[PDB]
């Protein structure tokens, strides 16, 4: 049993809810919250901007030190950093950004990072400002992640379309 409440069960291991990932993290304090990161860990907008704002910019300060030491992530890659006030850990995962022309096949590689964690609160990778089709992102998630993933979808309209269209 875990703390997550109000989710619809899609599969054995994948759950979904219409929720603000920031407000969900604040309530649950999950072991792992996933950030929709870019390779520079520049948390300007979308999910990353919202998570970072909720940490009062402490996520960005930590991230800048990580990049200064290690250099940029790979598209499809990840790093584990602090969850600050939101979670124990933040798994920063880089899905391909269609608005930069990145290979959508890298979305499966991105989701494979989730398998290193038994339970996660996450957004749909590569959707939102990254430009991918969220329906596709959900299919790749279900067909790739084997650990228990709780997906937060902010827009009620997209949430309802993801559920209604789910095979
Ligand atoms: O949650 C939403 O409504 C839209 C959304 C964002 Cl903002 C970021 C990543 C994935 C998705 Cl699906």
Short mmCIF file of N, CA and C and ligand atoms in Angstrom, two decimals:
data_model
loop_
_atom_site.label_atom_id
_atom_site.label_comp_id
_atom_site.label_asym_id
_atom_site.label_seq_id
_atom_site.Cartn_x
_atom_site.Cartn_y
_atom_site.Cartn_z
N UNK A 1 0.87 -1.21 0.00
CA UNK A 1 0.00 0.00 0.00
C UNK A 1 0.90 1.25 0.00
N UNK A 2 0.50 2.29 -0.74
CA UNK A 2 1.18 3.61 -0.71
C UNK A 2 0.11 4.71 -0.57
N UNK A 3 0.60 5.96 -0.47
CA UNK A 3 -0.06 7.25 -0.14
C UNK A 3 -0.82 7.84 -1.34
N UNK A 4 -0.58 7.36 -2.54
CA UNK A 4 -1.20 8.00 -3.74
C UNK A 4 -2.72 7.80 -3.73
N UNK A 5 -3.49 8.84 -4.00
CA UNK A 5 -4.96 8.79 -3.86
C UNK A 5 -5.64 9.33 -5.11
N UNK A 6 -6.79 8.74 -5.52
CA UNK A 6 -7.59 9.32 -6.59
C UNK A 6 -7.10 8.97 -7.99
N UNK A 7 -6.17 8.02 -8.14
CA UNK A 7 -5.64 7.65 -9.46
C UNK A 7 -6.55 6.62 -10.13
N UNK A 8 -6.66 6.69 -11.41
CA UNK A 8 -7.27 5.63 -12.23
C UNK A 8 -6.15 4.64 -12.55
N UNK A 9 -6.41 3.35 -12.47
CA UNK A 9 -5.45 2.29 -12.76
C UNK A 9 -5.50 2.01 -14.23
N UNK A 10 -4.41 2.15 -14.99
CA UNK A 10 -4.42 1.83 -16.43
C UNK A 10 -3.96 0.40 -16.66
N UNK A 11 -2.92 -0.03 -15.94
CA UNK A 11 -2.32 -1.35 -16.08
C UNK A 11 -1.91 -1.86 -14.72
N UNK A 12 -1.25 -3.01 -14.71
CA UNK A 12 -0.72 -3.59 -13.46
C UNK A 12 0.10 -2.55 -12.69
N UNK A 13 0.85 -1.70 -13.43
CA UNK A 13 1.88 -0.84 -12.78
C UNK A 13 1.72 0.65 -13.07
N UNK A 14 0.81 1.07 -13.92
CA UNK A 14 0.70 2.47 -14.35
C UNK A 14 -0.65 3.01 -13.88
N UNK A 15 -0.61 4.16 -13.26
CA UNK A 15 -1.75 4.88 -12.69
C UNK A 15 -1.76 6.29 -13.23
N UNK A 16 -2.91 6.94 -13.32
CA UNK A 16 -2.99 8.31 -13.89
C UNK A 16 -3.99 9.14 -13.11
N UNK A 17 -3.75 10.43 -13.02
CA UNK A 17 -4.64 11.37 -12.31
C UNK A 17 -4.56 12.74 -12.95
N UNK A 18 -5.66 13.49 -12.99
CA UNK A 18 -5.64 14.93 -13.33
C UNK A 18 -5.19 15.68 -12.10
N UNK A 19 -3.93 16.09 -12.10
CA UNK A 19 -3.38 16.78 -10.92
C UNK A 19 -2.19 17.64 -11.32
N UNK A 20 -1.97 18.69 -10.53
CA UNK A 20 -0.79 19.59 -10.66
C UNK A 20 0.36 18.81 -10.01
N UNK A 21 1.37 18.40 -10.78
CA UNK A 21 2.46 17.56 -10.19
C UNK A 21 3.09 18.22 -8.96
N UNK A 22 3.19 19.55 -8.96
CA UNK A 22 3.74 20.33 -7.82
C UNK A 22 2.90 20.08 -6.56
N UNK A 23 1.58 20.22 -6.70
CA UNK A 23 0.64 20.09 -5.55
C UNK A 23 0.61 18.63 -5.12
N UNK A 24 0.70 17.71 -6.06
CA UNK A 24 0.74 16.30 -5.73
C UNK A 24 2.00 15.94 -4.94
N UNK A 25 3.15 16.44 -5.39
CA UNK A 25 4.42 16.19 -4.68
C UNK A 25 4.36 16.75 -3.25
N UNK A 26 3.88 17.98 -3.15
CA UNK A 26 3.76 18.63 -1.82
C UNK A 26 2.91 17.78 -0.87
N UNK A 27 1.85 17.17 -1.37
CA UNK A 27 0.90 16.38 -0.53
C UNK A 27 1.52 15.02 -0.19
N UNK A 28 2.03 14.28 -1.16
CA UNK A 28 2.49 12.90 -0.99
C UNK A 28 3.90 12.84 -0.42
N UNK A 29 4.80 13.75 -0.82
CA UNK A 29 6.25 13.66 -0.50
C UNK A 29 6.76 12.31 -0.95
N UNK A 30 6.62 11.99 -2.25
CA UNK A 30 7.04 10.68 -2.73
C UNK A 30 8.56 10.50 -2.58
N UNK A 31 9.01 9.27 -2.59
CA UNK A 31 10.44 8.95 -2.63
C UNK A 31 11.07 9.61 -3.87
N UNK A 32 10.39 9.52 -5.01
CA UNK A 32 10.91 10.05 -6.30
C UNK A 32 9.84 10.87 -7.01
N UNK A 33 10.16 12.11 -7.34
CA UNK A 33 9.39 12.90 -8.32
C UNK A 33 10.26 13.01 -9.57
N UNK A 34 9.66 12.80 -10.72
CA UNK A 34 10.37 12.97 -12.00
C UNK A 34 10.19 14.40 -12.50
N UNK A 35 11.31 15.00 -12.92
CA UNK A 35 11.29 16.29 -13.62
C UNK A 35 11.44 16.05 -15.12
N UNK A 36 10.71 16.82 -15.89
CA UNK A 36 10.83 16.94 -17.35
C UNK A 36 11.98 17.87 -17.68
N UNK A 37 13.19 17.36 -17.55
CA UNK A 37 14.40 18.16 -17.66
C UNK A 37 14.85 18.30 -19.10
N UNK A 38 15.74 19.27 -19.31
CA UNK A 38 16.58 19.36 -20.52
C UNK A 38 18.03 19.04 -20.14
N UNK A 39 18.87 18.92 -21.17
CA UNK A 39 20.26 18.41 -20.93
C UNK A 39 21.08 19.38 -20.09
N UNK A 40 20.68 20.66 -20.06
CA UNK A 40 21.43 21.70 -19.31
C UNK A 40 20.87 21.85 -17.91
N UNK A 41 19.79 21.12 -17.57
CA UNK A 41 19.06 21.30 -16.29
C UNK A 41 18.73 22.79 -16.07
N UNK A 42 18.30 23.44 -17.12
CA UNK A 42 17.79 24.82 -17.06
C UNK A 42 16.27 24.76 -16.91
N UNK A 43 15.80 24.98 -15.71
CA UNK A 43 14.40 24.70 -15.35
C UNK A 43 13.53 25.95 -15.57
N UNK A 44 13.33 26.32 -16.82
CA UNK A 44 12.72 27.63 -17.15
C UNK A 44 11.21 27.62 -17.19
N UNK A 45 10.64 26.54 -17.64
CA UNK A 45 9.22 26.51 -17.98
C UNK A 45 8.68 25.11 -17.94
N UNK A 46 7.43 24.97 -18.24
CA UNK A 46 6.77 23.66 -18.20
C UNK A 46 6.82 23.07 -16.81
N UNK A 47 6.86 21.75 -16.73
CA UNK A 47 6.95 21.07 -15.45
C UNK A 47 8.23 21.51 -14.71
N UNK A 48 9.35 21.60 -15.40
CA UNK A 48 10.61 21.93 -14.71
C UNK A 48 10.54 23.31 -14.07
N UNK A 49 10.03 24.29 -14.82
CA UNK A 49 9.91 25.63 -14.24
C UNK A 49 9.03 25.64 -13.04
N UNK A 50 7.94 24.86 -13.06
CA UNK A 50 7.00 24.83 -11.94
C UNK A 50 7.63 24.12 -10.74
N UNK A 51 8.26 22.98 -10.96
CA UNK A 51 8.94 22.29 -9.83
C UNK A 51 10.01 23.20 -9.23
N UNK A 52 10.81 23.81 -10.08
CA UNK A 52 11.92 24.63 -9.56
C UNK A 52 11.34 25.81 -8.77
N UNK A 53 10.30 26.47 -9.27
CA UNK A 53 9.69 27.60 -8.56
C UNK A 53 9.22 27.14 -7.18
N UNK A 54 8.65 25.96 -7.08
CA UNK A 54 8.14 25.43 -5.81
C UNK A 54 9.27 25.19 -4.81
N UNK A 55 10.50 24.97 -5.27
CA UNK A 55 11.70 24.84 -4.41
C UNK A 55 12.34 26.18 -4.14
N UNK A 56 11.75 27.29 -4.55
CA UNK A 56 12.33 28.63 -4.31
C UNK A 56 13.67 28.73 -5.00
N UNK A 57 13.84 28.07 -6.16
CA UNK A 57 15.06 28.08 -6.98
C UNK A 57 16.19 27.19 -6.40
N UNK A 58 15.96 26.47 -5.33
CA UNK A 58 17.03 25.59 -4.81
C UNK A 58 17.33 24.46 -5.80
N UNK A 59 16.33 23.97 -6.52
CA UNK A 59 16.57 22.96 -7.57
C UNK A 59 17.55 23.51 -8.60
N UNK A 60 17.36 24.74 -9.07
CA UNK A 60 18.25 25.34 -10.09
C UNK A 60 19.66 25.52 -9.53
N UNK A 61 19.79 25.95 -8.29
CA UNK A 61 21.14 26.14 -7.71
C UNK A 61 21.87 24.79 -7.68
N UNK A 62 21.20 23.74 -7.20
CA UNK A 62 21.80 22.42 -7.14
C UNK A 62 22.16 21.94 -8.54
N UNK A 63 21.25 22.17 -9.49
CA UNK A 63 21.44 21.73 -10.87
C UNK A 63 22.64 22.42 -11.51
N UNK A 64 22.81 23.70 -11.28
CA UNK A 64 23.95 24.42 -11.85
C UNK A 64 25.27 23.84 -11.35
N UNK A 65 25.34 23.49 -10.09
CA UNK A 65 26.56 22.85 -9.55
C UNK A 65 26.72 21.49 -10.23
N UNK A 66 25.65 20.71 -10.42
CA UNK A 66 25.76 19.38 -11.08
C UNK A 66 26.33 19.58 -12.47
N UNK A 67 25.85 20.52 -13.24
CA UNK A 67 26.32 20.71 -14.63
C UNK A 67 27.77 21.20 -14.63
N UNK A 68 28.11 22.09 -13.72
CA UNK A 68 29.48 22.61 -13.68
C UNK A 68 30.44 21.44 -13.42
N UNK A 69 30.06 20.45 -12.64
CA UNK A 69 30.94 19.30 -12.37
C UNK A 69 30.89 18.28 -13.48
N UNK A 70 29.74 17.95 -14.00
CA UNK A 70 29.54 16.73 -14.82
C UNK A 70 29.28 17.04 -16.27
N UNK A 71 28.97 18.27 -16.66
CA UNK A 71 28.53 18.58 -18.02
C UNK A 71 27.09 18.13 -18.27
N UNK A 72 26.58 18.42 -19.44
CA UNK A 72 25.19 18.16 -19.77
C UNK A 72 24.83 16.68 -19.75
N UNK A 73 23.57 16.42 -19.47
CA UNK A 73 22.99 15.07 -19.65
C UNK A 73 22.97 14.76 -21.15
N UNK A 74 22.62 13.50 -21.46
CA UNK A 74 22.24 13.02 -22.80
C UNK A 74 20.72 13.12 -22.98
N UNK A 75 20.26 13.39 -24.17
CA UNK A 75 18.83 13.19 -24.48
C UNK A 75 18.54 11.71 -24.29
N UNK A 76 17.52 11.39 -23.49
CA UNK A 76 17.21 10.01 -23.10
C UNK A 76 17.81 9.67 -21.78
N UNK A 77 18.67 10.49 -21.20
CA UNK A 77 19.34 10.19 -19.95
C UNK A 77 18.72 10.84 -18.75
N UNK A 78 19.36 10.71 -17.61
CA UNK A 78 18.81 11.17 -16.34
C UNK A 78 19.89 11.37 -15.30
N UNK A 79 19.56 12.07 -14.25
CA UNK A 79 20.38 12.08 -13.02
C UNK A 79 19.47 12.18 -11.84
N UNK A 80 19.92 11.68 -10.71
CA UNK A 80 19.20 11.76 -9.43
C UNK A 80 19.77 12.89 -8.61
N UNK A 81 18.96 13.85 -8.23
CA UNK A 81 19.35 14.98 -7.36
C UNK A 81 18.36 15.05 -6.21
N UNK A 82 18.53 16.02 -5.36
CA UNK A 82 17.60 16.20 -4.24
C UNK A 82 16.18 16.47 -4.72
N UNK A 83 15.21 16.03 -3.91
CA UNK A 83 13.81 16.42 -4.12
C UNK A 83 13.42 17.66 -3.35
N UNK A 84 14.36 18.23 -2.60
CA UNK A 84 14.11 19.48 -1.86
C UNK A 84 12.86 19.28 -0.97
N UNK A 85 11.96 20.22 -1.03
CA UNK A 85 10.72 20.22 -0.24
C UNK A 85 9.64 19.41 -0.92
N UNK A 86 9.89 18.79 -2.06
CA UNK A 86 8.83 18.12 -2.82
C UNK A 86 8.85 16.61 -2.67
N UNK A 87 9.99 16.01 -2.43
CA UNK A 87 10.18 14.55 -2.53
C UNK A 87 11.51 14.24 -1.87
N UNK A 88 11.82 12.98 -1.63
CA UNK A 88 13.17 12.64 -1.18
C UNK A 88 14.18 12.97 -2.28
N UNK A 89 13.90 12.47 -3.48
CA UNK A 89 14.78 12.60 -4.65
C UNK A 89 13.99 13.18 -5.81
N UNK A 90 14.70 13.87 -6.70
CA UNK A 90 14.16 14.22 -8.03
C UNK A 90 14.97 13.48 -9.07
N UNK A 91 14.28 12.70 -9.89
CA UNK A 91 14.89 12.07 -11.06
C UNK A 91 14.68 13.00 -12.23
N UNK A 92 15.74 13.68 -12.66
CA UNK A 92 15.68 14.59 -13.81
C UNK A 92 15.84 13.76 -15.07
N UNK A 93 14.82 13.64 -15.88
CA UNK A 93 14.83 12.80 -17.09
C UNK A 93 14.67 13.68 -18.30
N UNK A 94 15.53 13.47 -19.30
CA UNK A 94 15.48 14.24 -20.55
C UNK A 94 14.78 13.45 -21.64
N UNK A 95 13.52 13.77 -21.90
CA UNK A 95 12.88 13.25 -23.08
C UNK A 95 13.29 14.08 -24.29
N UNK A 96 13.13 13.54 -25.50
CA UNK A 96 13.40 14.33 -26.70
C UNK A 96 12.41 15.49 -26.79
N UNK A 97 12.96 16.64 -27.22
CA UNK A 97 12.16 17.85 -27.46
C UNK A 97 11.91 17.91 -28.97
N UNK A 98 10.68 17.67 -29.39
CA UNK A 98 10.30 17.75 -30.83
C UNK A 98 10.55 19.17 -31.33
N UNK A 99 10.33 20.20 -30.55
CA UNK A 99 10.53 21.62 -30.98
C UNK A 99 12.04 21.92 -31.13
N UNK A 100 12.95 20.98 -30.83
CA UNK A 100 14.41 21.07 -31.16
C UNK A 100 14.78 20.04 -32.23
N UNK A 101 13.83 19.27 -32.78
CA UNK A 101 14.07 18.22 -33.78
C UNK A 101 14.70 16.91 -33.29
N UNK A 102 14.62 16.58 -32.00
CA UNK A 102 15.22 15.33 -31.43
C UNK A 102 14.43 14.07 -31.79
N UNK A 103 15.09 12.94 -31.85
CA UNK A 103 14.59 11.63 -32.31
C UNK A 103 13.56 11.10 -31.30
N UNK A 104 12.32 10.94 -31.72
CA UNK A 104 11.23 10.51 -30.81
C UNK A 104 11.52 9.10 -30.30
N UNK A 105 12.32 8.27 -31.01
CA UNK A 105 12.70 6.92 -30.55
C UNK A 105 13.44 7.01 -29.21
N UNK A 106 13.98 8.23 -28.88
CA UNK A 106 14.70 8.40 -27.62
C UNK A 106 13.73 8.45 -26.46
N UNK A 107 12.41 8.56 -26.74
CA UNK A 107 11.44 8.59 -25.65
C UNK A 107 11.45 7.27 -24.87
N UNK A 108 11.62 6.15 -25.57
CA UNK A 108 11.68 4.85 -24.86
C UNK A 108 12.89 4.81 -23.93
N UNK A 109 14.04 5.26 -24.42
CA UNK A 109 15.26 5.33 -23.59
C UNK A 109 15.02 6.20 -22.34
N UNK A 110 14.33 7.33 -22.53
CA UNK A 110 14.03 8.23 -21.41
C UNK A 110 13.22 7.48 -20.35
N UNK A 111 12.14 6.81 -20.77
CA UNK A 111 11.29 6.10 -19.81
C UNK A 111 12.03 4.95 -19.15
N UNK A 112 13.03 4.35 -19.81
CA UNK A 112 13.75 3.24 -19.17
C UNK A 112 14.42 3.68 -17.85
N UNK A 113 14.73 4.97 -17.69
CA UNK A 113 15.31 5.44 -16.44
C UNK A 113 14.36 5.18 -15.27
N UNK A 114 13.05 5.19 -15.53
CA UNK A 114 12.10 4.99 -14.42
C UNK A 114 12.26 3.60 -13.79
N UNK A 115 12.76 2.62 -14.57
CA UNK A 115 12.85 1.24 -14.08
C UNK A 115 13.86 1.11 -12.96
N UNK A 116 14.71 2.11 -12.73
CA UNK A 116 15.70 2.06 -11.64
C UNK A 116 15.07 2.46 -10.31
N UNK A 117 13.77 2.73 -10.27
CA UNK A 117 13.09 3.24 -9.07
C UNK A 117 11.78 2.47 -8.89
N UNK A 118 11.54 1.96 -7.68
CA UNK A 118 10.38 1.06 -7.49
C UNK A 118 9.05 1.80 -7.65
N UNK A 119 9.00 3.04 -7.23
CA UNK A 119 7.76 3.88 -7.28
C UNK A 119 8.14 5.30 -7.65
N UNK A 120 7.38 5.92 -8.52
CA UNK A 120 7.67 7.32 -8.97
C UNK A 120 6.39 8.08 -9.16
N UNK A 121 6.41 9.36 -8.88
CA UNK A 121 5.42 10.37 -9.34
C UNK A 121 6.01 11.05 -10.55
N UNK A 122 5.32 11.12 -11.67
CA UNK A 122 5.94 11.60 -12.92
C UNK A 122 4.94 12.32 -13.79
N UNK A 123 5.45 13.18 -14.70
CA UNK A 123 4.67 13.70 -15.81
C UNK A 123 4.88 12.80 -17.02
N UNK A 124 4.06 12.98 -18.04
CA UNK A 124 4.29 12.36 -19.32
C UNK A 124 5.50 12.96 -20.01
N UNK A 125 6.55 12.17 -20.22
CA UNK A 125 7.77 12.74 -20.82
C UNK A 125 7.54 13.11 -22.29
N UNK A 126 8.23 14.16 -22.75
CA UNK A 126 8.25 14.72 -24.14
C UNK A 126 6.97 15.46 -24.55
N UNK A 127 5.95 15.50 -23.70
CA UNK A 127 4.70 16.22 -24.02
C UNK A 127 4.83 17.66 -23.51
N UNK A 128 3.71 18.37 -23.42
CA UNK A 128 3.79 19.77 -22.99
C UNK A 128 4.66 20.58 -23.94
N UNK A 129 5.62 21.32 -23.40
CA UNK A 129 6.47 22.22 -24.24
C UNK A 129 7.55 21.45 -25.01
N UNK A 130 7.73 20.15 -24.75
CA UNK A 130 8.70 19.31 -25.50
C UNK A 130 8.12 18.87 -26.87
N UNK A 131 6.82 19.10 -27.10
CA UNK A 131 6.20 18.96 -28.44
C UNK A 131 5.73 17.59 -28.89
N UNK A 132 5.84 16.54 -28.07
CA UNK A 132 5.39 15.21 -28.53
C UNK A 132 3.89 15.07 -28.28
N UNK A 133 3.31 14.08 -28.95
CA UNK A 133 1.90 13.69 -28.71
C UNK A 133 1.76 13.00 -27.36
N UNK A 134 1.02 13.55 -26.39
CA UNK A 134 0.90 12.90 -25.09
C UNK A 134 0.30 11.49 -25.15
N UNK A 135 -0.56 11.22 -26.15
CA UNK A 135 -1.14 9.86 -26.29
C UNK A 135 0.00 8.88 -26.56
N UNK A 136 0.91 9.26 -27.44
CA UNK A 136 2.09 8.45 -27.75
C UNK A 136 2.95 8.30 -26.49
N UNK A 137 3.17 9.37 -25.78
CA UNK A 137 4.00 9.31 -24.57
C UNK A 137 3.43 8.30 -23.58
N UNK A 138 2.11 8.32 -23.38
CA UNK A 138 1.48 7.37 -22.46
C UNK A 138 1.66 5.94 -22.96
N UNK A 139 1.54 5.69 -24.26
CA UNK A 139 1.72 4.33 -24.78
C UNK A 139 3.16 3.87 -24.51
N UNK A 140 4.15 4.72 -24.81
CA UNK A 140 5.56 4.33 -24.56
C UNK A 140 5.75 4.08 -23.08
N UNK A 141 5.19 4.89 -22.22
CA UNK A 141 5.30 4.70 -20.76
C UNK A 141 4.80 3.31 -20.40
N UNK A 142 3.58 2.98 -20.81
CA UNK A 142 2.98 1.68 -20.43
C UNK A 142 3.80 0.53 -20.99
N UNK A 143 4.35 0.67 -22.15
CA UNK A 143 5.10 -0.42 -22.81
C UNK A 143 6.57 -0.45 -22.39
N UNK A 144 7.04 0.45 -21.55
CA UNK A 144 8.47 0.53 -21.17
C UNK A 144 8.67 0.42 -19.67
N UNK A 145 7.89 1.14 -18.88
CA UNK A 145 8.09 1.19 -17.44
C UNK A 145 7.45 -0.06 -16.84
N UNK A 146 8.20 -0.75 -16.03
CA UNK A 146 7.75 -1.94 -15.29
C UNK A 146 7.58 -1.67 -13.81
N UNK A 147 8.16 -0.60 -13.28
CA UNK A 147 7.99 -0.19 -11.90
C UNK A 147 6.70 0.61 -11.76
N UNK A 148 6.35 0.97 -10.56
CA UNK A 148 5.02 1.56 -10.32
C UNK A 148 5.08 3.07 -10.51
N UNK A 149 4.38 3.54 -11.50
CA UNK A 149 4.41 4.95 -11.90
C UNK A 149 3.04 5.57 -11.75
N UNK A 150 3.03 6.71 -11.09
CA UNK A 150 1.83 7.54 -10.84
C UNK A 150 1.97 8.78 -11.69
N UNK A 151 1.21 8.87 -12.75
CA UNK A 151 1.30 9.97 -13.73
C UNK A 151 0.35 11.07 -13.33
N UNK A 152 0.86 12.30 -13.28
CA UNK A 152 0.06 13.53 -13.04
C UNK A 152 -0.07 14.27 -14.35
N UNK A 153 -1.34 14.55 -14.72
CA UNK A 153 -1.78 15.37 -15.90
C UNK A 153 -2.59 16.58 -15.41
N UNK A 154 -2.06 17.78 -15.64
CA UNK A 154 -2.62 19.07 -15.18
C UNK A 154 -3.95 19.40 -15.88
N UNK A 155 -3.96 19.35 -17.21
CA UNK A 155 -5.19 19.73 -17.97
C UNK A 155 -6.28 18.66 -17.89
N UNK A 156 -7.48 19.06 -17.49
CA UNK A 156 -8.63 18.11 -17.38
C UNK A 156 -9.00 17.56 -18.75
N UNK A 157 -8.97 18.42 -19.77
CA UNK A 157 -9.27 18.06 -21.18
C UNK A 157 -8.29 16.96 -21.64
N UNK A 158 -6.95 17.15 -21.48
CA UNK A 158 -6.00 16.14 -21.97
C UNK A 158 -6.15 14.86 -21.14
N UNK A 159 -6.27 15.00 -19.85
CA UNK A 159 -6.49 13.81 -18.97
C UNK A 159 -7.65 12.95 -19.50
N UNK A 160 -8.77 13.61 -19.75
CA UNK A 160 -9.97 12.89 -20.23
C UNK A 160 -9.72 12.27 -21.59
N UNK A 161 -9.00 12.95 -22.48
CA UNK A 161 -8.68 12.37 -23.77
C UNK A 161 -7.72 11.18 -23.62
N UNK A 162 -6.73 11.26 -22.73
CA UNK A 162 -5.78 10.12 -22.51
C UNK A 162 -6.53 8.88 -21.99
N UNK A 163 -7.43 9.09 -21.03
CA UNK A 163 -8.20 7.93 -20.50
C UNK A 163 -9.10 7.34 -21.59
N UNK A 164 -9.86 8.22 -22.25
CA UNK A 164 -10.90 7.76 -23.20
C UNK A 164 -10.26 6.99 -24.34
N UNK A 165 -9.04 7.39 -24.77
CA UNK A 165 -8.37 6.81 -25.96
C UNK A 165 -7.43 5.66 -25.58
N UNK A 166 -7.33 5.30 -24.30
CA UNK A 166 -6.31 4.33 -23.83
C UNK A 166 -6.71 2.93 -24.24
N UNK A 167 -5.79 2.21 -24.86
CA UNK A 167 -6.05 0.85 -25.34
C UNK A 167 -5.54 -0.10 -24.26
O1 LIG B 1 -0.10 18.03 -17.84
C1 LIG B 1 -0.51 18.60 -18.87
O2 LIG B 1 -1.72 18.99 -18.96
C2 LIG B 1 0.43 18.83 -20.05
C3 LIG B 1 1.86 18.30 -19.90
C4 LIG B 1 2.87 19.13 -19.47
CL1 LIG B 1 2.50 20.81 -19.06
C5 LIG B 1 4.15 18.67 -19.35
C6 LIG B 1 4.43 17.37 -19.65
C7 LIG B 1 3.44 16.51 -20.06
C8 LIG B 1 2.17 16.98 -20.20
CL2 LIG B 1 0.90 15.87 -20.75
#
